[PDB]
């Protein structure tokens, strides 16, 4: 049912976000969590980009 | 559907840098008593760098609570306090400097202390027209969309003409405003100009540099 | 780059038309997987059950063929992302309450704003000939209480262009 | 290894003795974890001195603390709090000169309120104040990371906004891919949340 | 090894090439470089050069930058240029847009002293002299900014920073040991990749000092002392360009 959808869609990253938000003790935990999720997707794409650039530089050398 | 609108006054430095204000609210809850009872809530409002004037921050669920209706939101409208130097005009600042006439013609350097703790010295690049202006790019308020780019500082020039001039000063001004081009000058003209310049910049009896009494 | 599948419509030994459909195998994958598994094994002789004039052409029951629910499986609700705004939007149908979807499918014949967020839409018609075939199927000679009086049947059904 | 908060007051900064104070602090075994020069405003100082609310000395204390820039420091040592109290010496300069002549109050203080330094009292106050001036400085992974306290934290603050967000998402049911749903729920959380307002222009 | 070229060492090593400044201006520089470095937010403000003029009031031009990043395959410095007539009081040089940047390269000549001078082109286009000065400085900096190779390096967040473990350049007489400042550290681009006859290198191997002189821009000198590992560069003379390099060589 719907709980399976919620789980296998958000839960894995949401648990890490909650652990990060509770370790740091911010002043606005909800906003902290939202910005954390945005930075999460952004850092995934940028680490892919970083791997690509490193490989390209090695090949050119 | 009534809401309580409150001005929120900020200084240009706060809006430039991005403040984090804690405001107080006096909220009234109606009871059976003839008079009301009120409490002070604290609200954290986070103004981002260079938000446009007139920005509305709405707190939903905060406001005077009548017995039957859930209270409507409370609105804070951002407005800037007057500044001694700058006035913001959209995304860039405006500085209105009064300029001497000889600074306009001959040219000098205006001195301006920016909102950031950096001083600024801007040359006068030509004969400043009356009602003209100068523009220094990248020296305005930050762009609310992108937190790196900024506007351009705008100097609006209002000339300060001299109040008194003697007849010999007027003679000198007319000789300056009608001097022939340097390829049309006689040898007498060049010798006279050299003599006058050596006399006006005389190190002990010339008036090129004097000390104020 | 999606998958494609086609089937024929025939009324009383008279070929009424054929239709080809694209399946949104990038939006709602599991629904497409179930639909192709049932069009490979099933839908071969299942009547067109419910036909609303300016609404949708519905049908595709398996064990009964006349509009009552079937046992053996229940399909969960995948996604409300495809919006019913243009004709020829294939989707699955279920009871009022979600997570009871069955082989019953429906193809829209007009903009259907209300259905958005209530029914899983996971496909589309491909060309104008198929859409005109459905629009012509609307005005059958006689159809009694939203069912064609003769049996308008899927004679053939097959999958083309993809695994 | 613990750490405490300590600020050099405007009187020892107006006299240019801040650098000597830092050197003395470092000579005794401390380690300046983070330092910052900053000028408090009236509201920030009043919130800072919340414990002595409505006291008799509060007006002059808050008026002096916002007369010039101060220095804020975090000092780390095994016995940081008690060691900094001992080094900082007695709280009254006139008493300090008689009791401990070679102490920061005696050397740089001039008055009962112009003691030229401020330190913490207890670990709870120290952690509170470090969080007050250094919101991003990490620390205390034991009291915060505690299953009972963590469950209470999630329930009391994060859970009320999260439950509404996961419900709205279950109602909407966006695309089955992870990224779209994650972006949707993050935007929802950043859009309507209890403590922050909504920004319109 | 070094992190910022001196003014005294540069003025000492480049004295023989005519790259000298007045003594009173030297003292004024010594006093008023830190003042401008602190007034502006810059963290590295050196003397760029000295351009001549129809008057005696040459333009002393200084250059300073806060951040130096690696953008689009090029090490880009957010430079800021200042000018003065005497070393006491500096003013700023605002950048120029592209239309003026193309209408300022046709004004060949020697700049006058008052920076409130307007040149005329063709309708008449009235251009300020400070725009021409900035154009010439930008062109010279694009063509001539020389530093020893591997003197810079890339860190995290892609900022070009001084190589604190730089052990100097072997063979300091070969042009392969020098590079433009806006070449990324990994790239093997040097002054050799420029036109063959543009740069002249005279290397005193006993005292261990190398001089690189620009022949396309005749007034640009660069010195590199290997034993003490100090490199600097100055530009004296006007900013006009030597078009007919083929005939002179």
Swiss-Prot record, chain A:
Membership in a protein family: Belongs to the dpy-30 family.
Q: What does this protein do?
A: Flagellar radial spokes contribute to the regulation of dynein arm activity and thus the pattern of flagellar bending. They consist of a thin stalk, which is attached to the a subfiber of the outer doublet microtubule, and a bulbous head, which is attached to the stalk and appears to interact with the projections from the central pair of microtubules. Binds calmodulin in a calcium-dependent manner.
Q: What phenotype has been reported when the gene encoding this protein is knocked out? A: Absence of radial spokes.
Write the protein's name.
Flagellar radial spoke protein 2
* Full-protein positions shown: 8 to 68 of 738
Task: Give the organism's phylogenetic lineage.
Answer: Eukaryota, Viridiplantae, Chlorophyta, core chlorophytes, Chlorophyceae
Q: Any idea where this protein resides?
A: Cytoplasm, Cytoskeleton, Flagellum axoneme
* Miscellaneous field: In-gel analysis assays show kinase-like activity in vitro. However, such activity has not been confirmed using recombinant protein.
Q: What's noted about post-translational modification?
A: Probably methylated by PRMT1.
């Amino acid at each position: 049912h719907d709980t399976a959808y919620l789980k296998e869609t958000v839960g894995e990253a949401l648990a890490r976000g909650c652990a990060a938000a509770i370790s740091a003790q911010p002043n606005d935990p909800v906003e902290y969590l939202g910005l954390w999720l945005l930075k999460y997707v952004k850092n995934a794409e940028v680490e892919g980009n970083f791997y690509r650039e490193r490989q390209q530089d090695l090949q050119k050398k | 559907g009534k809401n309580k609108v409150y001005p929120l006054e900020l200084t240009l430095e706060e809006i430039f840098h991005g403040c984090l204000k804690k405001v107080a609210h006096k909220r009234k809850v109606l009871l059976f008593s003839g008079e009301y009872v009120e409490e002070e809530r604290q609200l954290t409002v986070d103004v981002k760098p260079g938000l446009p004037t007139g920005t509305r921050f709405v707190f939903e669920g905060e406001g005077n609570k009548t017995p039957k209706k859930e209270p409507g939101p409370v609105v804070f409208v951002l407005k800037p306090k007057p500044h001694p130097r700058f006035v913001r005009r959209g995304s860039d600042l405006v500085h209105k400097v009064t300029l001497p006439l000889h600074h306009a013609l001959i040219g000098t350097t205006l001195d301006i202390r920016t909102l950031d703790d950096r001083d600024l010295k801007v040359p006068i690049s030509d004969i400043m027209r009356p009602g003209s202006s100068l523009t220094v790019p990248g020296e305005g308020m930050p762009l609310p969309a992108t937190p790196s780019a900024r506007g351009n500082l705008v100097i609006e020039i209002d000339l300060l003409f001299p109040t008194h001039l003697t007849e010999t000063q007027k003679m000198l001004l007319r000789s300056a405003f009608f001097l022939p081009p340097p390829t049309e000058q006689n040898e007498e003209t060049k010798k006279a100009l050299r003599d006058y310049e050596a006399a006006f910049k005389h190190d002990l009896k010339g008036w090129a540099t004097v000390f104020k009494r | 780059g999606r998958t494609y599948c086609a089937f024929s419509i025939q009324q009383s030994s008279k070929l009424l038309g054929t239709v080809v459909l694209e399946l949104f195998t990038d939006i709602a994958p599991a629904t497409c997987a179930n639909f192709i598994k049932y069009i490979k094994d099933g839908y071969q002789g299942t009547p067109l059950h419910r036909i609303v004039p300016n609404g949708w052409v519905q049908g595709g029951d398996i064990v009964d063929g006349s509009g009552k629910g079937d046992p053996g499986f229940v399909l969960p609700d995948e996604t409300y992302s495809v919006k019913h705004d243009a004709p020829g939007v294939l989707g699955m149908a279920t009871g009022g309450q979600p997570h009871t979807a069955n082989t019953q499918f429906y193809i829209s014949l007009s903009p259907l704003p209300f259905l958005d967020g209530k029914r899983v839409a996971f496909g589309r018609v491909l060309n104008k000939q198929s859409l005109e075939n459905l629009l012509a199927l609307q005005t059958l000679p006689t159809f009694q209480n939203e069912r064609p009086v003769p049996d308008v049947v899927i004679a053939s059904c097959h999958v083309i262009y993809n695994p | 290894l613990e750490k405490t908060f300590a600020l050099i007051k405007p009187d020892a900064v107006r006299a240019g003795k801040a650098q000597e104070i830092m050197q003395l602090i470092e000579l005794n075994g401390f380690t300046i974890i983070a330092k910052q020069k900053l000028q408090l405003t009236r509201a920030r100082a009043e919130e800072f001195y919340g414990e002595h609310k409505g006291k008799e000395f509060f007006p002059k204390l808050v008026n002096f603390m916002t007369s010039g820039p101060i220095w804020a420091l975090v000092l780390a040592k095994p016995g940081a709090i008690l060691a900094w109290r001992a080094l900082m010496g007695p709280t009254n300069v006139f008493k300090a000169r008689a009791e401990q002549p070679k102490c920061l109050r005696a050397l740089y203080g001039t008055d009962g309120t112009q003691n030229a330094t401020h330190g913490s009292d207890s670990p709870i106050s120290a952690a509170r104040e470090i969080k007050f001036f250094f919101p991003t400085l990490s620390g205390d992974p034991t009291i915060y990371a505690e299953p009972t306290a963590a469950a209470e934290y999630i329930t009391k603050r994060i859970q009320p906004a999260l439950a509404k967000a996961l419900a709205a998402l279950a109602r909407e049911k966006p695309s089955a891919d992870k990224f779209e749903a994650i972006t949707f729920v993050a935007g929802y959380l950043l859009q309507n949340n209890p403590n922050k307002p909504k920004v319109l222009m | 090894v070094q992190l910022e070229p001196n003014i005294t060492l540069v003025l000492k090593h480049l004295a023989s090439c005519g790259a000298v400044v007045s003594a009173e201006q030297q003292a004024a520089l010594d006093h008023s470089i830190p003042i401008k470095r602190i007034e502006a937010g810059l963290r590295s403000l050196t003397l760029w050069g000295r351009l001549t003029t129809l008057n005696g009031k040459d333009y002393l031009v200084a250059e300073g930058y806060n951040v130096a990043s690696s953008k689009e395959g090029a090490a880009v410095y957010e430079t800021k240029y200042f000018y003065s007539q005497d070393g006491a009081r500096w003013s700023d040089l605002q950048p120029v847009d592209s239309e003026t940047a193309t209408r300022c390269a046709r004004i060949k000549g020697m700049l006058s002293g008052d920076p409130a001078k307007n040149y005329e082109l063709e309708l008449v286009f009235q251009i300020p002299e400070l725009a021409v000065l900035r154009c010439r400085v930008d062109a010279i900096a694009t063509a001539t900014s020389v530093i020893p190779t591997d003197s810079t390096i890339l860190n995290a967040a892609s900022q070009v920073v001084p190589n604190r473990l730089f052990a100097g350049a072997a063979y300091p007489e070969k042009l392969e040991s020098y590079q433009h400042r806006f070449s990324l550290p990994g790239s093997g681009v040097t002054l050799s990749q420029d036109l063959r006859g543009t740069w002249a290198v005279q290397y005193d191997a006993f005292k261990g000092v190398a001089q690189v002189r620009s022949l396309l821009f005749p007034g640009y000198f660069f010195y590199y002392a290997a034993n003490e590992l100090t490199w600097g560069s100055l530009y004296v003379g006007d900013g006009l360009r030597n078009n007919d390099l083929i005939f002179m060589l």
